[PDB]
Each structure stands twice: as C-alpha cells, then as structure tokens.
Design a protein around this motif. Structure first.
Motif, PDB file in Angstrom:
ATOM      1  N   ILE A   1       0.842  -1.151   0.000  1.00  0.00           N
ATOM      2  CA  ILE A   1       0.000   0.000   0.000  1.00  0.00           C
ATOM      3  C   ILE A   1       0.886   1.212   0.000  1.00  0.00           C
ATOM      4  CG2 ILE A   1      -1.928   1.103   1.197  1.00  0.00           C
ATOM      5  CD1 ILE A   1      -2.138  -1.314   2.979  1.00  0.00           C
ATOM      6  N   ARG A   2       0.481   2.234  -0.671  1.00  0.00           N
ATOM      7  CA  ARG A   2       1.144   3.490  -0.562  1.00  0.00           C
ATOM      8  C   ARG A   2       0.248   4.381   0.263  1.00  0.00           C
ATOM      9  NH1 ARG A   2       2.294  -0.604  -4.375  1.00  0.00           N
ATOM     10  NH2 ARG A   2       3.904   0.114  -5.844  1.00  0.00           N
ATOM     11  N   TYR A   3       0.788   5.426   0.845  1.00  0.00           N
ATOM     12  CA  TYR A   3      -0.019   6.329   1.676  1.00  0.00           C
ATOM     13  C   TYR A   3      -1.084   7.004   0.823  1.00  0.00           C
ATOM     14  CZ  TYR A   3       4.109   5.659   4.513  1.00  0.00           C
ATOM     15  OH  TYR A   3       5.148   5.085   5.201  1.00  0.00           O
ATOM     16  N   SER A   4      -0.751   7.180  -0.438  1.00  0.00           N
ATOM     17  CA  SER A   4      -1.606   7.788  -1.420  1.00  0.00           C
ATOM     18  C   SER A   4      -2.847   6.911  -1.719  1.00  0.00           C
ATOM     19  CB  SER A   4      -0.795   7.962  -2.675  1.00  0.00           C
ATOM     20  OG  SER A   4       0.404   8.683  -2.390  1.00  0.00           O
ATOM     21  N   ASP A   5      -2.775   5.624  -1.355  1.00  0.00           N
ATOM     22  CA  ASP A   5      -3.885   4.687  -1.572  1.00  0.00           C
ATOM     23  C   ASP A   5      -4.879   4.777  -0.454  1.00  0.00           C
ATOM     24  OD1 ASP A   5      -1.436   2.925  -2.903  1.00  0.00           O
ATOM     25  OD2 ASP A   5      -3.305   2.198  -3.785  1.00  0.00           O
ATOM     26  N   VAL A   6      -4.450   5.252   0.685  1.00  0.00           N
ATOM     27  CA  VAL A   6      -5.293   5.178   1.870  1.00  0.00           C
ATOM     28  C   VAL A   6      -6.235   6.374   1.999  1.00  0.00           C
ATOM     29  CG1 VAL A   6      -5.349   4.753   4.373  1.00  0.00           C
ATOM     30  CG2 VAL A   6      -3.319   4.073   3.030  1.00  0.00           C
ATOM     31  N   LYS A   7      -7.505   6.082   2.054  1.00  0.00           N
ATOM     32  CA  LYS A   7      -8.545   7.072   2.289  1.00  0.00           C
ATOM     33  C   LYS A   7      -8.893   7.135   3.742  1.00  0.00           C
ATOM     34  CE  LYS A   7     -11.146   9.085   0.229  1.00  0.00           C
ATOM     35  NZ  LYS A   7     -11.266  10.519  -0.094  1.00  0.00           N
ATOM     36  N   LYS A   8      -8.792   6.016   4.385  1.00  0.00           N
ATOM     37  CA  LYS A   8      -9.233   5.889   5.726  1.00  0.00           C
ATOM     38  C   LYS A   8      -8.536   4.713   6.365  1.00  0.00           C
ATOM     39  CE  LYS A   8     -13.562   5.542   8.304  1.00  0.00           C
ATOM     40  NZ  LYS A   8     -13.292   6.762   9.095  1.00  0.00           N
TER      41      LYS A   8
ATOM     42  N   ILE B   1       1.558   3.374   9.600  1.00  0.00           N
ATOM     43  CA  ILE B   1       0.370   3.889  10.201  1.00  0.00           C
ATOM     44  C   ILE B   1       0.624   5.264  10.734  1.00  0.00           C
ATOM     45  CG2 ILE B   1      -1.355   3.540  12.034  1.00  0.00           C
ATOM     46  CD1 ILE B   1      -1.275   1.536   9.495  1.00  0.00           C
ATOM     47  N   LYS B   2       1.752   5.422  11.380  1.00  0.00           N
ATOM     48  CA  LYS B   2       2.112   6.675  11.981  1.00  0.00           C
ATOM     49  C   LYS B   2       2.306   7.718  10.903  1.00  0.00           C
ATOM     50  CE  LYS B   2       2.527   5.600  15.347  1.00  0.00           C
ATOM     51  NZ  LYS B   2       3.829   5.223  15.952  1.00  0.00           N
ATOM     52  N   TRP B   3       2.878   7.271   9.820  1.00  0.00           N
ATOM     53  CA  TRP B   3       3.204   8.109   8.705  1.00  0.00           C
ATOM     54  C   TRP B   3       1.903   8.521   8.029  1.00  0.00           C
ATOM     55  CZ3 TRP B   3       4.045  10.367   4.170  1.00  0.00           C
ATOM     56  CH2 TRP B   3       5.320  10.848   3.869  1.00  0.00           C
ATOM     57  N   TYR B   4       0.942   7.577   7.953  1.00  0.00           N
ATOM     58  CA  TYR B   4      -0.347   7.893   7.385  1.00  0.00           C
ATOM     59  C   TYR B   4      -1.066   8.920   8.220  1.00  0.00           C
ATOM     60  CZ  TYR B   4      -4.898   8.023   5.308  1.00  0.00           C
ATOM     61  OH  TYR B   4      -6.048   8.491   4.714  1.00  0.00           O
ATOM     62  N   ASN B   5      -0.946   8.830   9.534  1.00  0.00           N
ATOM     63  CA  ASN B   5      -1.563   9.829  10.419  1.00  0.00           C
ATOM     64  C   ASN B   5      -1.050  11.236  10.127  1.00  0.00           C
ATOM     65  OD1 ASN B   5      -3.485   8.699  12.844  1.00  0.00           O
ATOM     66  ND2 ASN B   5      -2.016   7.148  12.259  1.00  0.00           N
ATOM     67  N   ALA B   6       0.208  11.333   9.741  1.00  0.00           N
ATOM     68  CA  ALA B   6       0.782  12.607   9.357  1.00  0.00           C
ATOM     69  C   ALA B   6       0.271  13.007   7.966  1.00  0.00           C
ATOM     70  CB  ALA B   6       2.299  12.529   9.375  1.00  0.00           C
ATOM     71  N   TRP B   7       0.376  12.087   7.025  1.00  0.00           N
ATOM     72  CA  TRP B   7      -0.082  12.269   5.632  1.00  0.00           C
ATOM     73  C   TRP B   7      -1.591  12.597   5.552  1.00  0.00           C
ATOM     74  CZ3 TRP B   7       1.226  12.340   0.430  1.00  0.00           C
ATOM     75  CH2 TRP B   7       0.265  11.842  -0.468  1.00  0.00           C
ATOM     76  N   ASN B   8      -2.378  11.935   6.377  1.00  0.00           N
ATOM     77  CA  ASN B   8      -3.830  12.143   6.447  1.00  0.00           C
ATOM     78  C   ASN B   8      -4.131  13.574   6.853  1.00  0.00           C
ATOM     79  OD1 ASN B   8      -6.486  12.079   8.412  1.00  0.00           O
ATOM     80  ND2 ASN B   8      -6.732  10.548   6.799  1.00  0.00           N
ATOM     81  N   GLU B   9      -3.273  14.136   7.697  1.00  0.00           N
ATOM     82  CA  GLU B   9      -3.402  15.518   8.150  1.00  0.00           C
ATOM     83  C   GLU B   9      -3.264  16.470   6.957  1.00  0.00           C
ATOM     84  OE1 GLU B   9      -1.605  16.808  12.039  1.00  0.00           O
ATOM     85  OE2 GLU B   9      -0.299  18.017  10.738  1.00  0.00           O
ATOM     86  N   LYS B  10      -2.451  16.083   6.003  1.00  0.00           N
ATOM     87  CA  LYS B  10      -2.267  16.870   4.807  1.00  0.00           C
ATOM     88  C   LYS B  10      -3.426  16.684   3.840  1.00  0.00           C
ATOM     89  CE  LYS B  10       1.793  17.025   6.882  1.00  0.00           C
ATOM     90  NZ  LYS B  10       3.017  16.944   6.058  1.00  0.00           N
ATOM     91  N   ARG B  11      -3.980  15.487   3.797  1.00  0.00           N
ATOM     92  CA  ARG B  11      -5.116  15.213   2.904  1.00  0.00           C
ATOM     93  C   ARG B  11      -6.427  15.751   3.464  1.00  0.00           C
ATOM     94  NH1 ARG B  11      -6.301   9.778   0.522  1.00  0.00           N
ATOM     95  NH2 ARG B  11      -7.047  11.170  -1.151  1.00  0.00           N
ATOM     96  N   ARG B  12      -6.582  15.694   4.781  1.00  0.00           N
ATOM     97  CA  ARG B  12      -7.759  16.260   5.444  1.00  0.00           C
ATOM     98  C   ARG B  12      -7.619  17.784   5.434  1.00  0.00           C
ATOM     99  NH1 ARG B  12     -12.577  14.361   5.753  1.00  0.00           N
ATOM    100  NH2 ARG B  12     -11.659  12.351   6.374  1.00  0.00           N
TER     101      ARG B  12
END
Length: 77
Positions: free
Chosen positions: A12-19, A62-73
C-alpha cells in the motif's frame, strides 16, 4: 490466535489510503487489526487491507499515514 493478513498485504502506498481504522479481521484475534481503505485505483479495489499490528513495519506506515492524512484532510496552515 492471529488472523492472517500476512503482514500488510499488497504494498500500500499512503496515497492509496482514504481511511485507516483499527478493528480486527476476526474478533477471535488479539487487539484491533489495522484496516486500510483504498481510494479507487488500487489493485485491492473494493477490499480493505489489513496490517497485522504486531509487526514493526505497521507502526511507521500507520504513523506516517496519520501525518499524511493531516495533509489530505488539510491541516496546512
């Protein structure tokens, strides 16, 4: 009792994750599993990925996604 998600499944890439949600693949598993919902054009389309949170590689992604999600949200201020 661990339910098989292998490790992270297909890469998975972080770019794949919506949720990203934590809930077990099976209730008869220890702790909540890490569930990843993809955006659309992913090889896993329509299925949620599950990382087995006992592994170390899960923690960064996961941790990285939490950071990345902050940018997407969009918390960019």
């Amino acid at each position: 009792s661990k339910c098989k998600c292998s490790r992270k499944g297909p890469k998975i890439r972080y770019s794949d994750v919506k949720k990203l949600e934590m809930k077990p693949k099976y209730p008869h598993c220890e702790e909540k599993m890490v569930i990843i919902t993809t955006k659309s054009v992913s090889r896993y389309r329509g299925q949620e990925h599950c990382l087995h949170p006992k592994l170390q590689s899960t923690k960064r992604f996961i941790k990285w996604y939490n950071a990345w999600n902050e940018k997407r949200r969009v918390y960019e201020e």
